Each structure stands twice: as structure tokens, then as C-alpha cells.
Amino acid sequence: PTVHVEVHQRGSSTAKKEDINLSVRKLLNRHNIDYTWTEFDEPFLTRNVQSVSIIDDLSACTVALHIFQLNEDGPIIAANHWVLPAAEFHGLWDSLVYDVEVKSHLLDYVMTTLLFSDKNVNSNLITWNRVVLLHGPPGTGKTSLCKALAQKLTIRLSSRYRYGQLIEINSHSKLVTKMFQKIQDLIDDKDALVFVLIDQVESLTAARDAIRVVNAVLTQIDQIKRHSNVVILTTSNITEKIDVAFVDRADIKQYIGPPSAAAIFKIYLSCLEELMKCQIIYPRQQLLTLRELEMIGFIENNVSKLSLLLNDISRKSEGLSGRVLRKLPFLAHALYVQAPTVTIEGFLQALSLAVDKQFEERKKLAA
């Protein structure tokens, strides 16, 4: 089909994008074989290009290049405002691990909505709108996915929108008008794709003159969703429960749930890789993926012993949220390692102790 290649232009670069386009294509001619490049023999590439990563063999495919430059300025009262591609969100997307390739659908759904918006596809004949709801138990990183989806969408849609904006509204809170007029001021630039994010929308319905401010925010949402370049992002923790009125509002609803032992193992692998990269886990060892274990039928030998053990830690980590899971190597290292350097076996033993102590606290909440 179409092969997608992401080019991370350096912040200090001053090159025309047309020129960064021609250099990367020359590089693809040589290797011609999902791999990421960080170093280049070309002086032009060394100067202007941080990394060129290919995202899902033969040369002759219809290859699309997305060249982007991160916006370092971080992170409008009272709201968080970022310019996309933002430097805070770099790599956020690849970090999020989900069972059913949720991210792919989500991207594809929102990508298609924008295409129907752009072609003025009639809502009454084919169902689409500009609201996306992500619902599910807490701790699945729903807000990180909205941020990650918005950065991806900005990078991928570079030929239609020159930059992206993300405005994050905190659920906890005239003043609203002052805030939506600035948002409208950003939306008035048709060279941008404006994302508005409302975290824990259900909190408005749950906590309810404060009835009037909640309703005023809905009319303001209603006014901004009217625009070609607006996309709205909501998240709710009461997945099972019906909600007012983001349910009716959102044509794209996606359920996010706790990670399986298959994902936990993908997550942990990414963590240990990081410690090995940083040399906190030393010396570096090979770890096996779940497919690799399956192909050796889980035999235990020097090659696989430690990967099997990590597997078993992933299975006993089930029922923990993804938020807990990425914090665990911190506590593992702080609580049990207590030293600048560890062998990978030493770290796995810290990680398991870590996992045991987590469930001990759970049972304390139950009792």
C-alpha cells in the first residue's frame, strides 16, 4: 500500500522543506529495505535532520514523507496551550501500548472524519462529526492518547494544515468567554488544525449557579465545532454509564481498557530497554519478545531464561493500570536496587518485589 516515513527536522534547521524532501528520498534509494535512522553520512542531513523513521522491503512503493519540526515553547488562562508538533509530545505516541491496535483505528477514524469534513460530506447521508470520546477505566493514559493522537494527526496531515494547536481544559473550575475567544482566535487561522481537549467531562454532570457555567461551556463547544479545522477531544471515566451530552455529541467513541499480560510484557520490555540504553542496567542483555518465546515453545535456557521470568512478572502484574506499570521500575529501582548500576537479573528481582508490594497496598484498600 502506502509507506509512511517521518522526518524530524532539527529545531536549528533553516532549510526549505522541499529541500529536506529531496535529501531523504535519496537516502531511501540506497538502503531500500520499520527502521529508524539517527545518523547520516550526508552533511546536509546531519545538519537539518534529527531522525528519519519509517512506520508501517521493496523500494517501489508509494512512499509519503512527513517532515516536521518540534515546537519547543512550553507548555491562555486558565488552560494549557501547546503548538503542534509539540516537543512535550515527542515519542508519547510510541510509548502507549494497547491490546487491539486501538491507536491505528483511532488515527484512521479521525483521519477519515477530517477527509469527510474537507470534502463537505453531508452528515445526514454518512455519519461523521468532529467530536472524539475516549472512555474507560482511569489509569489507561486517555489524556496522553489525546495528546499523542493530536501530534500524530498534525504530523500526518502536514499537506493540509501547516501547524497544529492543542488546548487542554481542566475539568475542575465572563472568564469562559475570555478563554473561548482566544481559542476562536487560533481557530481563525485556517492554516491550523485546532484540537480542544476536555479531561473527565463526566465530572461536569457528576458535580451539579455552577449549573450555569457548565451549560455556558457547552454552547461554547457548540460554536467552535462548526469550523472545518476544529477537532474536539473528550475523555470520561464512566465508560459503562451513559453521559450527557458528549455521548450524543461524539460519533467516534473508543473504549480503552487495562492492559493484558501481552501488553504489560511489551511495556516492561520498553522499560528495560530504556535502562539498558541509559546504562543503569549493565551489562546489556538480549531479551526475547513474546513471539520469540512462542517460537521456542517457552523452553528455558540461557538465551530465554530471563525473558521467561519477565513474562511471568507480566502475568502477575495483570489487573494493574498502565499508569501504575510505568511507575513500577522507578519504585523497583528506588526501593530495592538502591545503586547507580544493576545487572538485568538484579533488576528483574527488584521488579517482582515491586509488583508484590503494589498488590499488598491494594489489599489494604480492600480491607
Contacts of 95 (CB under 8 A, 6+ apart): 144, 270
Q: Which residues of 173-196 are buried (b: 16+ CB within 10 A; e: fewer)?
A: eeeeeebbeebbebbeeeebbbbb
Whether 237 and 265 map to the same domain: the answer is no
Whether 17 and 77 map to the same domain: the answer is no
Contacts of 150 (CB under 8 A, 6+ apart): 84, 89, 164, 166, 195, 197, 231, 233
Whether 29 and 155 map to the same domain: the answer is no
Joined together, the cell numbers standing for residue 51 give 531522525
Q: What is the DSSP string of 136-205?
A: SSTTS-HHHHHHHHHHHHHHHTTTT-SEEEEEEEPS---HHHHHHHHHHHHHT-TTEEEEEEETTTHHHH
Q: What is the resolution of this structure in A?
A: 3.0
140 annotated as ligand-binding? yes
Could you tell me if 358 and 328 are in contact, meaning their C-beta atoms sit under 8 angstroms apart? yes
Whether 113 and 235 map to the same domain: the answer is yes
139 annotated as ligand-binding? yes
Whether 26 and 98 map to the same domain: the answer is no
Distance (Å, whole) CA 315 – CA 335: 22
Whether 96 and 152 map to the same domain: the answer is yes
297 annotated as ligand-binding? no
Could you tell me if 233 and 198 are in contact, meaning their C-beta atoms sit under 8 angstroms apart? yes
Could you tell me if 7 and 67 are in contact, meaning their C-beta atoms sit under 8 angstroms apart? yes
Indicate the SS3 state at residue 227. Answer: coil
136 annotated as ligand-binding? yes
Distance (Å, whole) CA 293 – CA 90: 31
Q: What is the count of structural domains for the chain?
A: 3
Could you tell me if 51 and 10 are in contact, meaning their C-beta atoms sit under 8 angstroms apart? no
Distance (Å, whole) CA 116 – CA 130: 10
Whether 228 and 204 map to the same domain: the answer is yes
Indicate the SS3 state at residue 118. Answer: helix
Could you tell me if 232 and 193 are in contact, meaning their C-beta atoms sit under 8 angstroms apart? no
* Residue finishing a domain among 69, 96, 128: 69
Experimental method: X-ray
Joined together, the cell numbers standing for residue 179 give 478563554
Whether 155 and 35 map to the same domain: the answer is no
Joined together, the cell numbers standing for residue 159 give 499537506
Joined together, the cell numbers standing for residue 156 give 500526518
Whether 264 and 253 map to the same domain: the answer is no
* Residue finishing a domain among 259, 278, 302: 259
* Residue finishing a domain among 69, 85, 116: 69
Distance of CA 105 to the CA centre of its chain: 13
Q: What is the DSSP string of 1-69?
A: -EEEEEEEE-TT----HHHHHHHHHHHHHHH----EE---S-HHHHHHEEEEEEE---S-SEEEEEEEE
Distance (Å, whole) CA 307 – CA 280: 18
Joined together, the cell numbers standing for residue 29 give 534509494
Whether 219 and 267 map to the same domain: the answer is no
Nearest partner of 127 among 269, 251, 255, judged by Cα: 251
| Domain assignment of residue 64, given as a range | 1-69
137 annotated as ligand-binding? yes
322 annotated as ligand-binding? no
Distance (Å, whole) CA 283 – CA 146: 37
Whether 78 and 18 map to the same domain: the answer is no
329 annotated as ligand-binding? no
Whether 101 and 148 map to the same domain: the answer is yes
